[PDB]
Design a binder for this molecule. Structure first.
Ligand SMILES: O=c1ccn([C@@H]2O[C@H](COP(=O)(O)OP(=O)(O)OP(=O)(O)OP(=O)(O)OP(=O)(O)O)[C@@H](O)[C@H]2O)c(=O)[nH]1
Ligand SMILES: O=c1ccn([C@@H]2O[C@H](COP(=O)(O)OP(=O)(O)OP(=O)(O)OP(=O)(O)OP(=O)(O)O)[C@@H](O)[C@H]2O)c(=O)[nH]1
Length: 124
């Protein structure tokens, strides 16, 4: 299986790099994190901060989730992130992405005891 918290780490955590510097980043990362296995996941964000810093967002600014649930949290500080967006050239299983780097506040949904990120909602 996979816990929701572990799935969030696989899909959205990349503390190893400070920022997307390779235009290849998303093509490589979407594949290696298994987000192109059964389909090209259309949009996905990787966060370039420590796991502790991202987990800490679960105690920061409570905001509504896009789906209407109330368990979303916005980071007080901007964080370094990389948005990966599927191109038009992209046809599964050769999924192609544009790599966009930005510094933005992240919004995650949190659940559980301990209370940890389980879903990436948005960046603002
Ligand atoms: O920044 C993001 C957003 C999403 N995700 C991931 O993608 C999965 C679906 O998330 P969505 O259900 O939200 O698919 P979207 O395309 O984001 O939303 P729509 O376009 O339908 O409506 P909008 O035009 O309002 O969206 P926008 O213009 O960006 O505000 C989600 O589970 C995350 O893993 C992410 O990692 N980083
Ligand atoms: O606003 C929200 C949204 C969700 N949740 C909860 O957060 C948990 C994981 O949410 P998801 O289970 O839906 O996982 P997501 O990160 O959301 O994005 P996707 O599943 O689309 O990516 P894939 O389906 O492609 O996964 P894969 O192909 O295996 O790599 C779940 O318990 C929700 O109830 C939440 O509390 N507030």
């Amino acid at each position: 299986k996979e816990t929701a918290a572990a799935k969030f780490e696989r899909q959205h955590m990349d503390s190893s790099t400070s920022a997307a510097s390779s235009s290849n980043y998303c093509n490589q990362m979407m594949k290696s994190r298994n987000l192109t296995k059964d389909r090209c996941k259309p949009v996905n964000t990787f966060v370039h901060e420590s796991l502790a810093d991202v987990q800490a967002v679960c105690s920061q600014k409570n905001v509504a989730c896009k789906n209407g649930q109330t368990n979303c949290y916005q980071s007080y500080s901007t964080m370094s992130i990389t948005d990966c967006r599927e191109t038009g050239s992209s046809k599964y299983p050769n999924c192609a992405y544009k790599t966009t780097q930005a510094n933005k506040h992240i919004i995650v949904a949190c659940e559980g005891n301990p209370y940890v990120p389980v879903h990436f909602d948005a960046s603002v």
